[PDB]
Each structure stands twice: as C-alpha cells, then as structure tokens.
Design a protein around this ligand. Structure first.
Ligand code: 7IF
Length: 263
C-alpha cells in the first residue's frame, strides 16, 4: 500500500477504544491533530479496520472510493488513513447518536422531534444522495439504518462504498440505477415520518411483490402532510423515468422545510 501525502495520518496520534457496532470492524477511537490548525487537539473518531481476513482489497477499494467521492456535510467523510507502519486504518467521521432509524424511535411520542426537524432530516439525506449521484455512486441500499446521526443532528449517509427497500427493477431484474436509489429514498421518507417505522407493516415479503405489481403502495402515515406523502408516491412509480430526480427531491423538500419552519 502506497503512501498518500493527502491522507496519510500518523498512528502515534491515534488511540483506539471499545469496538463499535459489530462486523470488518468499526472501532471507537481518539485522534490527535486531525485538524492541522490545532495539532494538540483531541477529537473522537471512527476507525474502519480489518484478524481473519483474506478483504484487504475491499477495504482499500472503499478507501479510494471515499477519496474519489470527496467530502460533503451529509455523508460519512474520510478523515485520515494509516497505511504505513502497521495494520490498515480507515478513519472516518463519527455519529454519536447512531443510525436514523433508532434515533427516531427513541424520540417517539406515546414529541422531542418537531416537524421541521423531521423535514430537515429528509432534506439532508436528499442532499447527500444528490451529491453521491453527481459523484457517480449508486448505493443502492438506502435506508434509515444506513443514515447516521451526529451530535449536531446532522444526517450522514454511510456505506456508500432488504427487499422492502428495493425498487421493482432491482428485485426481479437486478437493475440498479440512480432511479432505484430514488425508490429507496421514498421508503426512507416513509421511515422518517413514521418516526422509524418498519415498511409494509404485517405484510409477508413474498406478498410484497404481488402488491407492488398490483399497483399497491404503503398508506399515508397518521400525521403526514399530503405534499410529503405525494413525494413518497412519486418515488414509488413503476416506471423509473417517472420518478423524481434527487435534484427535484431536494428542491421539493427545501420548499416544505422553509414553509414548515414558519409555524
Ligand atoms: C459502517 O457502518 C457501521 C458503523 N457506522 C458508524 C458508526 C459511528 N458511531 C456510532 O454509531 N456511535 C453510536 C453510538 C454512540 C457513539 C459515541 C461516539 C461515537 C464516535 O465518537 C466514534 F466512536 F468515535 F465514532 N460513535 C457512536 N460512527 C461512524 C460510522 C461509520 N462509517
């Protein structure tokens, strides 16, 4: 593994802690001097690392993809890498509040999350996806369990390097596109405005394809506005070309965000 002067970070300034999540490995860590302005500062970071792998090429591939995509507010960004003098470390931003799904469920009314905040969550994810799209990257598994929440309530898309979430052309035909991502985004919308609900409640997955093929979709969530449900329904069009682009989704969600923020 070659040295990249643009990303190589010294191991001597990286202290590891308790394992985070599960499996590959993502660990809790302490980084010193991540911000070149203050080298003596300590920040909490996430380190993606490889003890029983053959998978190094997979981690390296992800690393280089992360370098290639670039940075954005709404994605899990690369901070530094440790390729020299030891095992491979991929240091990325942290999300202290876990994924969006669990984040929403914990803040459920029998309402800690105001409605403008919900629309914000959706807007942010839509922004991150638009960026990912423009950087030529299909997910294609976009879900609430893949969107992470930082301490500043910033949405950050992860794993940009499951039947309930898949578009029809992906399920049956194995065709993955930007427009298939938009379908999934429709499901994520439904996930958000149900405050972390499980899609297609009480419906066997084998019955899902029939329902979708029969033109059926999920119902409007109890206290969801028509506009936001209308966006869900547009994402869930059978024809991919009849689905919105992320640009239109960003504008549509910004339109609601700004409006709801009034009262
Ligand atoms: C690859 O996705 C599986 C794990 N995803 C991540 C998970 C996290 N962090 C995270 O979930 N939590 C959850 C709960 C409490 C917590 C407290 C601190 C931190 C971080 O400061 C640190 F651990 F350093 F990442 N992270 C978390 N950070 C970055 C990523 C990913 N790329």
């Amino acid at each position: 593994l070659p040295l990249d002067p643009l990303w190589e970070f010294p191991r001597d300034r990286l202290v590891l802690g308790k394992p985070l999540g599960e499996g590959g490995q993502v660990v809790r860590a302490e980084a010193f001097g991540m911000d070149p302005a203050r080298p003596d500062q300590a920040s909490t970071v996430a380190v993606k690392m490889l003890d029983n792998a053959s998978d190094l090429a997979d981690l390296v591939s992800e690393m280089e993809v992360m370098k290639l995509i670039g940075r954005h507010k709404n994605i899990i960004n690369l901070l530094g890498v440790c390729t020299q003098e030891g095992p491979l470390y991929v240091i990325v931003e942290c999300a202290a509040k876990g994924n969006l799904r669990e984040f929403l469920r914990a803040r459920r009314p029998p309402g800690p999350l105001s409605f403008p905040v919900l629309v914000s969550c959706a807007y942010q994810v839509a922004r991150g996806m638009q960026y990912l799209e423009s950087r030529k990257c299909i997910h294609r598994d976009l879900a609430a369990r893949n969107v992470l929440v930082t301490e500043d309530n910033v949405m950050k898309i992860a794993d940009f390097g499951p039947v309930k979430w898949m578009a029809p052309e992906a399920l049956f035909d194995r065709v993955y596109t930007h427009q298939s991502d938009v379908w999934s985004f429709g499901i994520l919308l439904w996930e958000i405005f149900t405050l972390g609900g499980s899609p297609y409640p009480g419906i066997p997955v084998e019955e899902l394809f029939s329902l979708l093929r029969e033109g059926h979709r999920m119902d409007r969530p109890p206290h969801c506005p028509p506009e936001l449900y209308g966006l869900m329904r547009e994402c869930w069009h059978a024809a991919p070309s009849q689905r919105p682009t992320f640009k239109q989704l960003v504008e549509a969600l910004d339109k609601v965000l700004l409006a709801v923020s009034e009262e």
